[PDB]
RNA sequence: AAUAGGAGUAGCUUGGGGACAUUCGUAUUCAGAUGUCAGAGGUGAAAUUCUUAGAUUUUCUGGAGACGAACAACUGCGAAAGCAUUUGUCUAAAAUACUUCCAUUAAUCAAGAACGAAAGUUAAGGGAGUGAAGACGAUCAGAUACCGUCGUAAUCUUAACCAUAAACUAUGCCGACUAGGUGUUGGAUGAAGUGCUUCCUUCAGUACCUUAUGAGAAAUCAAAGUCUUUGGGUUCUGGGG
């Protein structure tokens, strides 16, 4: 675990086979269409995958299509510029900073706010290195509202 | 003494009192040097 | 028939007071301390002194008129200690022995729900 | 601003006058000249206009207050006490 | 429950409804009657509040008292300027009054 | 040696735990460390209990209790015979 | 402006008449106040703290 | 109270060990005891609010409020001795000799 | 080898060969005219596809389904 | 898709986590009464101290600051410092569940920064009780002390600061492998008791007892083990007094 003191191991088990279920014999186009509809509706890729498992009843996209959902969105050119993970982390950090602006005696909120921003810097640096954020890019707390707008 | 400033275990005056006595002495020397210069 | 009064017993290490009142507790009947009925007015007010005071109170209460008492116990100032003072058992035994009719008995010592600091430092009383 | 290392606004008084008093003056003077928030109109335009008197510029209203800032604790405690019953 | 409900509604009216800020536009909307609900701060002036309440009453339309100042109703809408009073003119997916 | 494995107290997973002050003498002692005795006692002696029953209004007797919970510091408890010095092995025995 | 007899205890008040009808003659300098500390049973007198 | 007496009422309750209890400890969860506490207060408030002061005084004697608390709170988590620790008056009408005499007689 | 032990197969998450604890169920409610794929250990709540009434309630640990329906287990 | 890591979703998950608002109880203390009548406080034993202008005691009111017992633990939470009334709000958190997403993002970290008990400093309140300083009575060979009684600074809150403590699980952190049993706290899985309760299996915490042909200078230690049969990774530290 990165910052917590736990080491909890609750996770996705995954079956041995990468083959399609018996139940669904659907064409790749049907699977792309279903994802496209969820994407168009404004759902984000984790939400789409969770929904695809639950609402549509389908085993996950990498097994039934042979290609990752983010990659499919990118191939159609429609993938989001800001990462889903980065978006939620920045949103939590903005929420903490708004709260901290009101309350100056919340030490734990201050401690978490520096911790989360440090985590944002590490994630940002990795995204810059993989060329998913610009070379000139840097995190700032001033512009963070604009980032997630 | 070393880092274990304390540990009164065989035959010596109290560490805390030595520390107080020396702090008081140190202040007096610091005044004397300040007076002189 | 019969009439009830209220016997307050306030027992502390220095003295054990027997103070009988109306059933309301508004109006007194007898104040007798314990130390007044100590012969030399010193020490702690022994079990014997506690007995003599309670006997005097019983004689006076019968002289006044009242035949029965409810007992209200109070131990050593509460916050200082919750211990019953030395004469308390003797005083209760004396009131029962005396011949007065014994109604309800309660501990009504003032009890801190909370807490606050008391005399002597954090090291406590050394003696 | 960045002109002074740590004296700030009492730099106007300069080297003259004892330093601890200049520090005491610094705290009062900082409080005195701040532009406070107006309860009535929602702008940070409330200034002290005379010793006990604080006027908001925007809504043009005079609140009687403390000497060096708008409120003491005492009045607030009294105000709450009156309200509660 | 209530503060969450009004903020969620305010976010939904921002997201998918239509709304309008400030005294004159709100007055125009109430007189027109195309509004459904006015949300007014207690830090809105007494007379201005009273007038808006009469206009609403006259047009048989809703007013909700906001627990929060003129600026706070603005910060909820992510605007630097104080709002003081606003009018919903098209509901979000959640109906603000219902 | 180091005598106490646990510090003489419920030290585990905790930093500060509040001091109480000794019933005997006001000595501060952590609630986790403190020597606690419940002391459910009646005020009555045996002869007194007989006299109170005989004196009593009603046959039914409520038997007035003392409920104390009296807390001792280590120094007091050993002096006043609430504890012993045990023995090196026996210092771990919870009976 | 209220008669002091009708004040709750622990109120903070100012501009007290030195005796009745004398127009706020006590407790009048900057930041000053008096406290009402008690009320008589008969209601004739009231007890204040300067 | 309906006849205009404002009171403060204090109700204790202990956990009960039900059908099986090999585990010696019989504490309840904080979420559960908060839920019990909330439920208890509403039952007390409801029983008090309806009636006049005289009827409430009659309800206290056989502990009817406690009986209703116990019945409801067994569903959340079994409890044991549920009593009223104290009642204090906040705001008591002290006048009306006629009503006092009528209640007395 | 470790394989003949039947007990370890159900002990937390990863085993000798990890395979999902979760499974799929064919669920039907009368008056909906459907029997429909559903996932034990779902997290998003599910309504019937032909009508507004509830299908499954998910909760912490597997799913709780509903008692208003009848459930076949759906298998490879 | 690493029994590495992050992110998500889900559950009327969890808890004295943090902050803000709110609110309750009680004692103590004071004031207003109240009924009494002589001593009461006080300790090794007294004296100092208080009391006929009514003390101490009783009961009622009102005020004020204060605190959160009992429950309550070889108990819970917190990065540590630290955290116990009620209800609400703003916040974070770990485990569980996952045929959900990312696709190596990591580990430990000089420099630098954050939070950091108690006391102290500086400013406002507040100054109940306790009470460094200080004052008396004793005590005693002397006592500037222990003890008794009084008592300013301080304790508390708000606003700054200060940056150390036996700031101790006296054991740097991450990582694997090692041994039983008794327990215990938070979840998930099954069954029998009367939907729920119990018990079984399993995870993440967490202690104890026994055992180490394991270790150690022994105390002891399930880590201080898998280390002359010496090398999983890394920061920091010590070199007789």
Swiss-Prot record, chain D:
Keyword Repeat set for record: no
Compartment(s) where it occurs, according to its Swiss-Prot or TrEMBL record: Cytoplasm
GO-annotated molecular function: structural constituent of ribosome; zinc ion binding
Membrane-spanning residues: none
Zinc finger (C4-type): 38-59
BP GO annotations: translation
InterPro entries reported in the protein's UniProt record: Ribosomal_eL37/eL43, Ribosomal_eL43, Ribosomal_protein_eL43, Ribosomal_zn-bd
UniProtKB keywords: Cytoplasm, Metal-binding, Ribonucleoprotein, Ribosomal protein, Zinc, Zinc-finger
GO cellular component: cytosolic ribosome; ribonucleoprotein complex
Quaternary state and interactors: Component of the large ribosomal subunit. Mature ribosomes consist of a small (40S) and a large (60S) subunit. The 40S subunit contains about 32 different proteins and 1 molecule of RNA (18S). The 60S subunit contains about 42 different proteins and 3 molecules of RNA (28S, 5.8S and 5S).
Family: Belongs to the eukaryotic ribosomal protein eL43 family.
PANTHER family the record matches: 60S RIBOSOMAL PROTEIN L37A (PTHR48129), LARGE RIBOSOMAL SUBUNIT PROTEIN EL43 (PTHR48129:SF1)
Known role: Component of the ribosome, a large ribonucleoprotein complex responsible for the synthesis of proteins in the cell. The small ribosomal subunit (SSU) binds messenger RNAs (mRNAs) and translates the encoded message by selecting cognate aminoacyl-transfer RNA (tRNA) molecules. The large subunit (LSU) contains the ribosomal catalytic site termed the peptidyl transferase center (PTC), which catalyzes the formation of peptide bonds, thereby polymerizing the amino acids delivered by tRNAs into a polypeptide chain.
Name of this chain's protein: Large ribosomal subunit protein eL43
Organism expressing this protein natively: Plasmodium falciparum (isolate 3D7)
From Swiss-Prot, chain H:
Range covered out of full length: 129 to 233 of 262
Family: Belongs to the eukaryotic ribosomal protein eS1 family.
Subcellular location(s) of the protein: Cytoplasm
The protein, known as: Small ribosomal subunit protein eS1
Function: Component of the ribosome, a large ribonucleoprotein complex responsible for the synthesis of proteins in the cell. The small ribosomal subunit (SSU) binds messenger RNAs (mRNAs) and translates the encoded message by selecting cognate aminoacyl-transfer RNA (tRNA) molecules. The large subunit (LSU) contains the ribosomal catalytic site termed the peptidyl transferase center (PTC), which catalyzes the formation of peptide bonds, thereby polymerizing the amino acids delivered by tRNAs into a polypeptide chain.
Gene responsible for this protein: RPS3A
Complexes and interactors: Component of the small ribosomal subunit. Mature ribosomes consist of a small (40S) and a large (60S) subunit. The 40S subunit contains about 32 different proteins and 1 molecule of RNA (18S). The 60S subunit contains about 42 different proteins and 3 molecules of RNA (28S, 5.8S and 5S).
